[PDB]
Amino acid sequence: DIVMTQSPSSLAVSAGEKVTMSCKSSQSLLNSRTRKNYLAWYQQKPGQSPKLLIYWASTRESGVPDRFTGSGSGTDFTLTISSVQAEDLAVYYCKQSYNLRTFGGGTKLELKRADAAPTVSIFPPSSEQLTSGGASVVCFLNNFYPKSIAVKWKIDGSERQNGVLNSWTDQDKKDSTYSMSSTLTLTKDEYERHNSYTCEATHKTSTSPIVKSFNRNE
Amino acid sequence: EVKLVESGGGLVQSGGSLRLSCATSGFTFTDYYMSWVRQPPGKALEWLAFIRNKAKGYTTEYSSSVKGRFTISRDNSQSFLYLQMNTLRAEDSATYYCARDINPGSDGYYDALDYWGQGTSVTVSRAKTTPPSVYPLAPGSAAQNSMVTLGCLVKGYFPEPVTVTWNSGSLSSGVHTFPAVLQSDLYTLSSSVTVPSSTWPSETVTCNVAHPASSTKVDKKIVPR
Ligand SMILES: O=C(O)[C@@]1(O)C[C@@H](O)[C@@H](O)[C@@H]([C@H](O)CO)O1
């Protein structure tokens, strides 16, 4: 067992600011023969494979921006990012290769930006779905910040809670906003009992819910 | 160009076996150790195994988590890496990556995993392979102008993953593909795309959906309505 641990588990930093993250090994990774620390850092952006940033604790891989600096020795290591850029959003892993290989649990780096209101769109069920006896109503909430958001579905004015499924994207690597999709699924029979379908979004960027709706009749 | 490409992932029943493969090119294969690393959905990377290079006699090592159950091997004639997986369990569900590991004999020796494949996904479950239904999301009404948001709903499939593109990848900006959500042993995901009003419906917008486990290929044009 070489046990690897990282800190913090997550944090958020504004573009242009400095980021520090830590990695501990349960035993020294310093090879007294080679004089090298067998410690590497990897960057994994949302939906990508890991990418090598640093090895031998402090040697930057060719191609990696010089704002990334590894330091430390023995059982304690640090990855520092000066002037964080929006594209740096990712999970960062350290990894020992002194004795086979073991990854730490990762540090998730998110980016802080100015609050942004969501753009909200509602979509009725497609004729192809209704033909098969189902009816899904979809609401997209795009490009907002911070991540915290609430969606309420109302059918003919009353709130509907079951049949709802929600999903959030990771932060965007360009504009540092988030997005979310909410899908309400009904039988076609239940869908045809009602007229008004409403997606209501509660976000800190305004005091009134953002409300998008359509009428089945229309 | 160093190239690593995993294949072989898919749905396997608990207790079952699966062999993953990794095709390599762009470097002298026998010069390098090769590693397999996995990552369960939403969890940390986990190193599983390596096989050493020629100088080291192609010997193998394994993490405790898979020793006795998995076997790593290599074909040096065609530059392939394999991972045979036996006695699979739910906890083995994950994306599996192959990575080029060290060449200790080189004067340029550095100790890292410097190149990684795109990964191949494995799901260990008794649930049934189910292809997605793909439905168009077109607006029912809108203001007098500007940008328009469309989408596709990819509903009721198993297992992960699916791929979604728009106009065969040619629409990439302004796309959001939402992570799939599991409910009652079927996944649902959605994808939105936002384009200028002046370009749709005058120009075609189509979502392209693939579900490897069922060999599904769908093109769905988003028509006004
Ligand atoms: O197990 C090995 O063959 C290897 O060479 C892997 C290297 O990454 C490193 O762990 C090395 C040890 O430092 C040898 O003591 O062993």
Ligand SMILES: [Mg+2]
């Ligand atoms: Mg290099």
Ligand SMILES: [Mg+2]
């Ligand atoms: Mg966005």
Ligand SMILES: [Mg+2]
């Ligand atoms: Mg009701």
Ligand SMILES: [Zn+2]
């Ligand atoms: Zn050994």
